[PDB]
Amino acid sequence: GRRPARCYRYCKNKPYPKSRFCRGVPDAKIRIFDLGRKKAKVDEFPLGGHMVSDEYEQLSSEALEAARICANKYMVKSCGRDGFHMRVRLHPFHVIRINKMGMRGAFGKPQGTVARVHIGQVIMSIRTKLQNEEHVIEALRRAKFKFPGRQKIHISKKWGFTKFNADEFEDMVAKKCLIPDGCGVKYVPSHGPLDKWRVLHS
Amino acid sequence: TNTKGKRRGTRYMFSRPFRKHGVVPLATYMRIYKKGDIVDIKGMGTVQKGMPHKCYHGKTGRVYNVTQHAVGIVVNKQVKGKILAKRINVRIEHIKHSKSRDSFLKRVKENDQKKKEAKEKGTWVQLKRQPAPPREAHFVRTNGKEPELLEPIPYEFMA
Amino acid sequence: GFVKVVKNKAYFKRYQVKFRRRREGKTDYYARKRLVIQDKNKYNTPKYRMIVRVTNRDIICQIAYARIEGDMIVCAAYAHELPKYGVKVGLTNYAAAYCTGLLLARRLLNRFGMDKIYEGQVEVTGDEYNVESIDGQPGAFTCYLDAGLARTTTGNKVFGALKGAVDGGLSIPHSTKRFPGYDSESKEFNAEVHRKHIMGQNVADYMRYLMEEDEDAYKKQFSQYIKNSVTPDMMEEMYKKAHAAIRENPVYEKKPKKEVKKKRWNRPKMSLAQKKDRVAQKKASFLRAQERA
Amino acid sequence: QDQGEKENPMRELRIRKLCLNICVGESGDRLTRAAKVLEQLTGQTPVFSKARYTVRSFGIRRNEKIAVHCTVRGAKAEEILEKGLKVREYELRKNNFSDTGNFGFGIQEHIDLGIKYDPSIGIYGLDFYVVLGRPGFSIADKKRRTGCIGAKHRISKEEAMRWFQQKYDGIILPGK
RNA sequence: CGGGGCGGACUGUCCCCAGUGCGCCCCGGGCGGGUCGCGCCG
RNA sequence: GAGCAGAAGGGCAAAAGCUCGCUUGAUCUUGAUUUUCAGUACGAAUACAGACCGUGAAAGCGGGGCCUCACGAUCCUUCU
RNA sequence: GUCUACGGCCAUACCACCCUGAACGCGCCCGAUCUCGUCUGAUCUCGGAAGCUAAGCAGGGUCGGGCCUGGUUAGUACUUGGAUGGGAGACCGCCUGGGAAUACCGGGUGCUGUAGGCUU
Ligand SMILES: [Mg+2]
Ligand SMILES: [Mg+2]
Ligand SMILES: [Mg+2]
Ligand SMILES: [Mg+2]
Ligand SMILES: [Mg+2]
Ligand SMILES: [Mg+2]
Ligand SMILES: [Mg+2]
Ligand SMILES: [Mg+2]
Ligand SMILES: [Mg+2]
Ligand SMILES: [Mg+2]
């Protein structure tokens, strides 16, 4: 019922999102993009591991769902159901068409959704305890088999999912350049009202 | 295939710039367009009357006729194989003075008054403009400081 | 924490401000464009406009023509300079509007050297009069009236200055419809009750109304008419002397006063060092007060 | 004493328009009679209000004649106030005051005070909505050089209530 | 890296408190640019 | 972030939107020009110029609709 | 040092809040006889001058928001022209020239024309 992924592997069709022009699009296979302990604050999960994809191709929505399940089964089995947070950093926005059965009026109707990646772009993200690095690489290594192209595993120097480096994360939090809320942190520039400096720092 | 409407493809061409909508500034109205001076055709979209065609936007011509609210412009249009001088009536909203001509005029009067002073004193001076000559051998001081040694950074994968 | 903010950060990022004099509510740029723009096939010819601005205390009349760098005033008249001859109290009224319009006309043509020609109407009737150019002599000065944001209803003071200027000899196009004489129903210009407004007779019959009926409410209304005894009588006469005094000398002279010190009445903008210092000792003060505990 | 008696003349809380209103869900003779009560009560011919949407739920279409209202200013608004307030016995209890400094209330019957019952005229009720201001609030309605009034020249709900107690010895905020 | 004397302005160490800029000249150190610059060296 | 008759796009705030008042420039004419273009026509449109008008206090604005579409030769017929 | 009337550029000018304002002026302000408009002299029109800077307005402040201007981002992204360069492809590197935009970090926050007033 679905064509092989080799028929839509390449980004050659001028991004075609679901809009008022492209209606009647079936729902994408992947609806959940965050798994594990999505509530762990910032500190228990300082280790962030990424799956970057070094090919300009498009990954389908069913492949994104399949790799997410594959990474969830392993991370739960090994690190524990509460020992990790997963974030699929790819959304299947592009819509692929199919010309069902000659060439007259060949413009196809939507059939599925894919996500287009670049040479440097993370597909999946896992934050967890520091001692789970080997388990994170293995979980990503297995989920990589569910994608058409070639991907790399990279242990990011940044603290968890936060955009700030792990070595300096603790000391700016200490001097309150960052405050923790939710899964990430809030940068606090020293250029706002002074009353907001004094409700902090006190 | 595509239509032949007089404003097809002018979605952005005649659109106003960001935070530049509304009342047309009046200094554009007291500019004085003589006969035979060079003007750029822009085609602002706030004023719909007397606007040029999309093939004259961003093109430069010379005024040949001055009217109550518009001028006649002789502007070259390149049809397929030949260029012919078109005459178009365009309201003064959609034009402005070309300072390519203004820059040439200020130079000429500079040369003319330099020509006079060169003769009065009796010396000789250069008048034309030369195309950026080579670079006039010079010395470069180190000031007792060793030039900094550079070296390509090792590759590290960031993102 | 209940309602979405309208004036948020994105609101100001794309808020486009109006023209400064539109924001201040002083200039109608829709009317100004039709009023000051010259025909393109004139190339230098000024479009003179008679600016009439009636204020709480004053009346301002000037002739202007618009250039790129800003309007140029060729001559201006003020109602606060009327007391230098004749009428001294009773400004910013219709009789004052006519006088400053007449004064503005007289001092302009005198400055142009054509005062002896285009005498206008030395005798004052509140009727239709339009000056005409004299062949062999320079033509009449033609200008248009700029009412501004004022609502131009019948009997507006902005038209009192028009009558004064056109009685002085300025060729201002107009119609007698917006004059106090005009009657809306029968569409007639009485032109005699108009001349009553010009000589301030409507106010004159107001004062004589009050004296017989009241005293304290009369001096509350016309307090400064009592000083120097501006009675309802001789009020037509004092406007006649004012009109003749304008014809005799409309020239304006100012006064030299440079024996003034260089005192600054504002406070200069604080510098970056002061601003950085001020937040600095605000930091320490908060920390010291916190540590006092 | 002297520290407070500096701004009093031009910060005084003054009653602007009363803007009395009557709304009836239909038109015709009954609405026409409801209009007549305004001339009885204000000596001032009111204006009629039209509905702009056809809802048909309770039943009204667009551009009908639905409500009549008038705005009263000056001393006439002053005595219509204490007329309505003495009907209420000086009791606006908790929250009739808006955050913009004006307040309103409704009376169910008009024949009690003022104008005597006329069997020909009906039994209409109405609601008063007094708006307060200070000298200078008119610059917002001006044509030339319009502007806002400034933060500390506005009227808050609390200072509106203080004015009502200080002027009519009213009772506000029962402990409920 | 700054020293003396005069007019404002800030701080929750405010009678004994502290800190910032600009105003006048008198100086102190270092840096650069022109000077018959003046010499010496190649 | 409304509305401007309609498709969409552009434009517009003491506007071009809404409500009133008065009106018929949606009138009579000659050429020029732009647009598709072969630089032919039709259609549409832009600057004028000459009358006769409308509106406004006036500057001005208006010979249809805020702009981009909304339409038609020879021969014949009908009317002026 | 300012302010009025008319402006040019149209946020370095706007928005929010706080402080200060001598003199002219600008306003608030008082009234409805006339002119003129309203349901309402609230707006508009007119006639005034008891009071007041309360507000408008002006100047200043805010580790203010915006806006303007720099640095970084970054010789990065992208790109003109070249190769019998690589790679199965996707794409990528080099040669020859051009070369950005966020986040982040600084600085600033109306300039000016005409005419006319005030300021020992
Ligand atoms: Mg197969
Ligand atoms: Mg394709
Ligand atoms: Mg096409
Ligand atoms: Mg098309
Ligand atoms: Mg048109
Ligand atoms: Mg107007
Ligand atoms: Mg006319
Ligand atoms: Mg004509
Ligand atoms: Mg800021
Ligand atoms: Mg390159």
Side-chain angles (χ1 to χ4, degrees), chain A residues 175-198:
Chain A
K175 89 218 173 194
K176 270 160 308 210
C177 259
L178 305 154
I179 62 137
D181 57 25
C183 154
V185 295
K186 293 242 204 71
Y187 191 68
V188 180
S190 60
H191 74 7
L194 208 23
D195 280 2
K196 251 172 191 274
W197 168 89
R198 97 182 70 229

PDB file of all heavy atoms in Angstrom, chain A residues 175-198:
ATOM      1  N   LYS A 175      26.209  31.664  39.183  1.00  0.00           N
ATOM      2  CA  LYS A 175      26.150  33.120  39.220  1.00  0.00           C
ATOM      3  C   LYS A 175      24.868  33.664  38.606  1.00  0.00           C
ATOM      4  O   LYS A 175      24.737  34.885  38.454  1.00  0.00           O
ATOM      5  CB  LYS A 175      27.384  33.724  38.536  1.00  0.00           C
ATOM      6  CG  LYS A 175      27.277  33.978  37.040  1.00  0.00           C
ATOM      7  CD  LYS A 175      28.591  33.652  36.346  1.00  0.00           C
ATOM      8  CE  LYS A 175      28.466  33.729  34.835  1.00  0.00           C
ATOM      9  NZ  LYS A 175      29.627  33.093  34.156  1.00  0.00           N
ATOM     10  N   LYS A 176      23.930  32.783  38.254  1.00  0.00           N
ATOM     11  CA  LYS A 176      22.567  33.141  37.877  1.00  0.00           C
ATOM     12  C   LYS A 176      22.507  33.836  36.524  1.00  0.00           C
ATOM     13  O   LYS A 176      21.612  34.651  36.278  1.00  0.00           O
ATOM     14  CB  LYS A 176      21.927  34.009  38.962  1.00  0.00           C
ATOM     15  CG  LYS A 176      21.207  33.206  40.032  1.00  0.00           C
ATOM     16  CD  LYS A 176      21.022  34.014  41.303  1.00  0.00           C
ATOM     17  CE  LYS A 176      22.340  34.605  41.769  1.00  0.00           C
ATOM     18  NZ  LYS A 176      22.395  34.753  43.250  1.00  0.00           N
ATOM     19  N   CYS A 177      23.452  33.519  35.638  1.00  0.00           N
ATOM     20  CA  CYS A 177      23.280  33.869  34.234  1.00  0.00           C
ATOM     21  C   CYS A 177      22.232  32.989  33.571  1.00  0.00           C
ATOM     22  O   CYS A 177      21.706  33.355  32.517  1.00  0.00           O
ATOM     23  CB  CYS A 177      24.610  33.756  33.488  1.00  0.00           C
ATOM     24  SG  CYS A 177      25.448  35.329  33.192  1.00  0.00           S
ATOM     25  N   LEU A 178      21.928  31.839  34.170  1.00  0.00           N
ATOM     26  CA  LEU A 178      20.865  30.957  33.719  1.00  0.00           C
ATOM     27  C   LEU A 178      20.021  30.558  34.918  1.00  0.00           C
ATOM     28  O   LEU A 178      20.555  30.289  35.996  1.00  0.00           O
ATOM     29  CB  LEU A 178      21.417  29.693  33.049  1.00  0.00           C
ATOM     30  CG  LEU A 178      22.382  29.848  31.877  1.00  0.00           C
ATOM     31  CD1 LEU A 178      23.284  28.631  31.780  1.00  0.00           C
ATOM     32  CD2 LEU A 178      21.610  30.052  30.595  1.00  0.00           C
ATOM     33  N   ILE A 179      18.706  30.524  34.730  1.00  0.00           N
ATOM     34  CA  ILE A 179      17.818  29.979  35.751  1.00  0.00           C
ATOM     35  C   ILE A 179      17.126  28.756  35.162  1.00  0.00           C
ATOM     36  O   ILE A 179      16.761  28.758  33.978  1.00  0.00           O
ATOM     37  CB  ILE A 179      16.807  31.023  36.253  1.00  0.00           C
ATOM     38  CG1 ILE A 179      15.892  31.495  35.122  1.00  0.00           C
ATOM     39  CG2 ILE A 179      17.528  32.198  36.898  1.00  0.00           C
ATOM     40  CD1 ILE A 179      14.438  31.597  35.524  1.00  0.00           C
ATOM     41  N   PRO A 180      16.949  27.690  35.930  1.00  0.00           N
ATOM     42  CA  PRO A 180      16.333  26.481  35.376  1.00  0.00           C
ATOM     43  C   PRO A 180      14.821  26.461  35.517  1.00  0.00           C
ATOM     44  O   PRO A 180      14.291  26.661  36.614  1.00  0.00           O
ATOM     45  CB  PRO A 180      16.980  25.352  36.190  1.00  0.00           C
ATOM     46  CG  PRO A 180      17.719  26.014  37.330  1.00  0.00           C
ATOM     47  CD  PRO A 180      17.446  27.481  37.296  1.00  0.00           C
ATOM     48  N   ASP A 181      14.117  26.224  34.413  1.00  0.00           N
ATOM     49  CA  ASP A 181      12.694  25.926  34.480  1.00  0.00           C
ATOM     50  C   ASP A 181      12.330  24.969  33.353  1.00  0.00           C
ATOM     51  O   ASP A 181      12.894  25.030  32.259  1.00  0.00           O
ATOM     52  CB  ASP A 181      11.833  27.202  34.450  1.00  0.00           C
ATOM     53  CG  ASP A 181      12.079  28.076  33.227  1.00  0.00           C
ATOM     54  OD1 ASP A 181      12.522  27.585  32.171  1.00  0.00           O
ATOM     55  OD2 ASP A 181      11.808  29.288  33.333  1.00  0.00           O
ATOM     56  N   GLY A 182      11.395  24.072  33.645  1.00  0.00           N
ATOM     57  CA  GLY A 182      11.027  23.083  32.659  1.00  0.00           C
ATOM     58  C   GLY A 182      12.182  22.152  32.348  1.00  0.00           C
ATOM     59  O   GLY A 182      13.004  21.822  33.206  1.00  0.00           O
ATOM     60  N   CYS A 183      12.241  21.719  31.088  1.00  0.00           N
ATOM     61  CA  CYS A 183      13.327  20.876  30.613  1.00  0.00           C
ATOM     62  C   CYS A 183      14.613  21.654  30.354  1.00  0.00           C
ATOM     63  O   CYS A 183      15.700  21.084  30.487  1.00  0.00           O
ATOM     64  CB  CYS A 183      12.891  20.143  29.340  1.00  0.00           C
ATOM     65  SG  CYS A 183      14.228  19.648  28.228  1.00  0.00           S
ATOM     66  N   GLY A 184      14.520  22.936  30.010  1.00  0.00           N
ATOM     67  CA  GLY A 184      15.697  23.724  29.703  1.00  0.00           C
ATOM     68  C   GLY A 184      15.969  24.824  30.708  1.00  0.00           C
ATOM     69  O   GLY A 184      15.562  24.726  31.867  1.00  0.00           O
ATOM     70  N   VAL A 185      16.663  25.877  30.280  1.00  0.00           N
ATOM     71  CA  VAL A 185      16.991  27.001  31.143  1.00  0.00           C
ATOM     72  C   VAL A 185      16.657  28.299  30.421  1.00  0.00           C
ATOM     73  O   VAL A 185      16.527  28.344  29.197  1.00  0.00           O
ATOM     74  CB  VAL A 185      18.472  27.002  31.578  1.00  0.00           C
ATOM     75  CG1 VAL A 185      18.773  25.803  32.451  1.00  0.00           C
ATOM     76  CG2 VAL A 185      19.376  27.022  30.361  1.00  0.00           C
ATOM     77  N   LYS A 186      16.520  29.363  31.207  1.00  0.00           N
ATOM     78  CA  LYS A 186      16.274  30.706  30.701  1.00  0.00           C
ATOM     79  C   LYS A 186      17.558  31.513  30.812  1.00  0.00           C
ATOM     80  O   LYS A 186      18.117  31.644  31.905  1.00  0.00           O
ATOM     81  CB  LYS A 186      15.162  31.397  31.489  1.00  0.00           C
ATOM     82  CG  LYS A 186      13.788  30.800  31.315  1.00  0.00           C
ATOM     83  CD  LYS A 186      12.839  31.814  30.713  1.00  0.00           C
ATOM     84  CE  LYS A 186      11.403  31.485  31.062  1.00  0.00           C
ATOM     85  NZ  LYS A 186      11.109  31.724  32.501  1.00  0.00           N
ATOM     86  N   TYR A 187      18.020  32.054  29.690  1.00  0.00           N
ATOM     87  CA  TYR A 187      19.110  33.015  29.744  1.00  0.00           C
ATOM     88  C   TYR A 187      18.626  34.302  30.397  1.00  0.00           C
ATOM     89  O   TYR A 187      17.504  34.755  30.157  1.00  0.00           O
ATOM     90  CB  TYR A 187      19.649  33.309  28.347  1.00  0.00           C
ATOM     91  CG  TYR A 187      20.949  34.082  28.364  1.00  0.00           C
ATOM     92  CD1 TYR A 187      22.114  33.505  28.843  1.00  0.00           C
ATOM     93  CD2 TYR A 187      21.006  35.390  27.902  1.00  0.00           C
ATOM     94  CE1 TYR A 187      23.302  34.205  28.861  1.00  0.00           C
ATOM     95  CE2 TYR A 187      22.190  36.099  27.919  1.00  0.00           C
ATOM     96  CZ  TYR A 187      23.334  35.501  28.398  1.00  0.00           C
ATOM     97  OH  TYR A 187      24.517  36.202  28.416  1.00  0.00           O
ATOM     98  N   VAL A 188      19.477  34.890  31.230  1.00  0.00           N
ATOM     99  CA  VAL A 188      19.121  36.119  31.932  1.00  0.00           C
ATOM    100  C   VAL A 188      20.114  37.207  31.544  1.00  0.00           C
ATOM    101  O   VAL A 188      21.181  37.325  32.164  1.00  0.00           O
ATOM    102  CB  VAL A 188      19.087  35.907  33.453  1.00  0.00           C
ATOM    103  CG1 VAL A 188      18.710  37.198  34.156  1.00  0.00           C
ATOM    104  CG2 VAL A 188      18.112  34.796  33.812  1.00  0.00           C
ATOM    105  N   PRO A 189      19.821  38.004  30.521  1.00  0.00           N
ATOM    106  CA  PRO A 189      20.717  39.109  30.172  1.00  0.00           C
ATOM    107  C   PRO A 189      20.689  40.194  31.232  1.00  0.00           C
ATOM    108  O   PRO A 189      19.690  40.392  31.928  1.00  0.00           O
ATOM    109  CB  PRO A 189      20.152  39.615  28.840  1.00  0.00           C
ATOM    110  CG  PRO A 189      18.717  39.232  28.875  1.00  0.00           C
ATOM    111  CD  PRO A 189      18.626  37.957  29.663  1.00  0.00           C
ATOM    112  N   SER A 190      21.811  40.896  31.360  1.00  0.00           N
ATOM    113  CA  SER A 190      21.922  41.993  32.320  1.00  0.00           C
ATOM    114  C   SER A 190      21.588  43.328  31.651  1.00  0.00           C
ATOM    115  O   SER A 190      22.323  44.309  31.749  1.00  0.00           O
ATOM    116  CB  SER A 190      23.317  42.014  32.931  1.00  0.00           C
ATOM    117  OG  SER A 190      24.302  42.189  31.927  1.00  0.00           O
ATOM    118  N   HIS A 191      20.443  43.350  30.955  1.00  0.00           N
ATOM    119  CA  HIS A 191      20.027  44.561  30.257  1.00  0.00           C
ATOM    120  C   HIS A 191      18.519  44.798  30.320  1.00  0.00           C
ATOM    121  O   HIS A 191      17.964  45.462  29.438  1.00  0.00           O
ATOM    122  CB  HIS A 191      20.537  44.540  28.798  1.00  0.00           C
ATOM    123  CG  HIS A 191      19.803  43.600  27.888  1.00  0.00           C
ATOM    124  ND1 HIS A 191      18.665  42.933  28.285  1.00  0.00           N
ATOM    125  CD2 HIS A 191      20.011  43.246  26.596  1.00  0.00           C
ATOM    126  CE1 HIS A 191      18.220  42.187  27.290  1.00  0.00           C
ATOM    127  NE2 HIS A 191      19.019  42.360  26.252  1.00  0.00           N
ATOM    128  N   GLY A 192      17.844  44.283  31.344  1.00  0.00           N
ATOM    129  CA  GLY A 192      16.430  44.522  31.506  1.00  0.00           C
ATOM    130  C   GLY A 192      16.157  45.623  32.507  1.00  0.00           C
ATOM    131  O   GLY A 192      16.983  46.513  32.718  1.00  0.00           O
ATOM    132  N   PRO A 193      14.981  45.603  33.129  1.00  0.00           N
ATOM    133  CA  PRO A 193      14.748  46.484  34.278  1.00  0.00           C
ATOM    134  C   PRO A 193      15.573  46.033  35.472  1.00  0.00           C
ATOM    135  O   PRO A 193      15.885  44.850  35.621  1.00  0.00           O
ATOM    136  CB  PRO A 193      13.245  46.339  34.546  1.00  0.00           C
ATOM    137  CG  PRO A 193      12.678  45.777  33.282  1.00  0.00           C
ATOM    138  CD  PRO A 193      13.753  44.908  32.713  1.00  0.00           C
ATOM    139  N   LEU A 194      15.932  46.991  36.331  1.00  0.00           N
ATOM    140  CA  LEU A 194      16.716  46.649  37.514  1.00  0.00           C
ATOM    141  C   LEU A 194      15.869  45.946  38.562  1.00  0.00           C
ATOM    142  O   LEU A 194      16.400  45.191  39.384  1.00  0.00           O
ATOM    143  CB  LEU A 194      17.356  47.901  38.115  1.00  0.00           C
ATOM    144  CG  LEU A 194      18.662  47.730  38.892  1.00  0.00           C
ATOM    145  CD1 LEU A 194      19.388  46.462  38.475  1.00  0.00           C
ATOM    146  CD2 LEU A 194      19.554  48.946  38.707  1.00  0.00           C
ATOM    147  N   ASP A 195      14.557  46.186  38.557  1.00  0.00           N
ATOM    148  CA  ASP A 195      13.686  45.522  39.520  1.00  0.00           C
ATOM    149  C   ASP A 195      13.674  44.016  39.300  1.00  0.00           C
ATOM    150  O   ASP A 195      13.513  43.245  40.253  1.00  0.00           O
ATOM    151  CB  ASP A 195      12.271  46.089  39.428  1.00  0.00           C
ATOM    152  CG  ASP A 195      12.125  47.401  40.167  1.00  0.00           C
ATOM    153  OD1 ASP A 195      13.134  47.887  40.718  1.00  0.00           O
ATOM    154  OD2 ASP A 195      11.002  47.945  40.197  1.00  0.00           O
ATOM    155  N   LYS A 196      13.839  43.577  38.051  1.00  0.00           N
ATOM    156  CA  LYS A 196      13.892  42.150  37.775  1.00  0.00           C
ATOM    157  C   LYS A 196      15.235  41.540  38.151  1.00  0.00           C
ATOM    158  O   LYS A 196      15.313  40.324  38.357  1.00  0.00           O
ATOM    159  CB  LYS A 196      13.576  41.884  36.303  1.00  0.00           C
ATOM    160  CG  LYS A 196      12.224  41.226  36.100  1.00  0.00           C
ATOM    161  CD  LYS A 196      11.835  41.157  34.636  1.00  0.00           C
ATOM    162  CE  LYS A 196      10.383  40.735  34.481  1.00  0.00           C
ATOM    163  NZ  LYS A 196      10.223  39.255  34.480  1.00  0.00           N
ATOM    164  N   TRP A 197      16.291  42.348  38.240  1.00  0.00           N
ATOM    165  CA  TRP A 197      17.551  41.858  38.785  1.00  0.00           C
ATOM    166  C   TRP A 197      17.439  41.630  40.284  1.00  0.00           C
ATOM    167  O   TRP A 197      18.074  40.726  40.838  1.00  0.00           O
ATOM    168  CB  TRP A 197      18.682  42.841  38.486  1.00  0.00           C
ATOM    169  CG  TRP A 197      19.935  42.547  39.255  1.00  0.00           C
ATOM    170  CD1 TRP A 197      20.954  41.727  38.876  1.00  0.00           C
ATOM    171  CD2 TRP A 197      20.285  43.051  40.549  1.00  0.00           C
ATOM    172  NE1 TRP A 197      21.926  41.701  39.847  1.00  0.00           N
ATOM    173  CE2 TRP A 197      21.535  42.502  40.887  1.00  0.00           C
ATOM    174  CE3 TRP A 197      19.662  43.915  41.453  1.00  0.00           C
ATOM    175  CZ2 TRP A 197      22.176  42.794  42.089  1.00  0.00           C
ATOM    176  CZ3 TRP A 197      20.297  44.201  42.644  1.00  0.00           C
ATOM    177  CH2 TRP A 197      21.541  43.641  42.952  1.00  0.00           C
ATOM    178  N   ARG A 198      16.644  42.458  40.963  1.00  0.00           N
ATOM    179  CA  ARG A 198      16.584  42.410  42.417  1.00  0.00           C
ATOM    180  C   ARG A 198      15.538  41.431  42.931  1.00  0.00           C
ATOM    181  O   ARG A 198      15.599  41.044  44.102  1.00  0.00           O
ATOM    182  CB  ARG A 198      16.331  43.813  42.969  1.00  0.00           C
ATOM    183  CG  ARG A 198      14.889  44.121  43.303  1.00  0.00           C
ATOM    184  CD  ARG A 198      14.755  45.549  43.801  1.00  0.00           C
ATOM    185  NE  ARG A 198      14.971  46.515  42.730  1.00  0.00           N
ATOM    186  CZ  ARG A 198      15.773  47.566  42.818  1.00  0.00           C
ATOM    187  NH1 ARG A 198      16.464  47.820  43.917  1.00  0.00           N
ATOM    188  NH2 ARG A 198      15.885  48.385  41.776  1.00  0.00           N
TER     189      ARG A 198
END
